[PDB]
Design a protein around this ligand. Structure first.
Ligand SMILES: *[C@@H]1O[C@H](CO)[C@@H](O)[C@H](O)[C@H]1NC(C)=O
Lengths: 23, 48
């Protein structure tokens, strides 16, 4: 909670491990 | 509307899908730009 899109070519690939697996 | 088309708006070239918008342009306002400094909204020269 304490930590806080146009795509003309740039993209944000999702991480392989979701937050649930890390937890 | 509603399809990827080439448009010429008052001499402005562009290519994209034209859809109905909820933005309320001011009477003088003509072109709209998004956060990334790109044309995202336009006002039709014939119908306001
Ligand atoms: C231009 O003509 C159309 C009908 O042909 C009309 O609907 C439109 O309002 C006219 N433009 C202006 C600025 O009144």
């Amino acid at each position: 909670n304490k930590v806080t899109q146009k795509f003309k070519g740039l993209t944000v690939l999702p991480p392989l491990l979701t937050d649930e697996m890390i937890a | 509307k509603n399809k990827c088309v080439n448009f010429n708006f008052n001499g402005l070239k562009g290519t994209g899908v034209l859809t109905e918008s909820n933005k309320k342009f001011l009477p003088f306002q003509q072109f709209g730009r998004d956060i990334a400094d790109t044309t995202d909204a336009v006002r039709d020269p014939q119908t306001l």
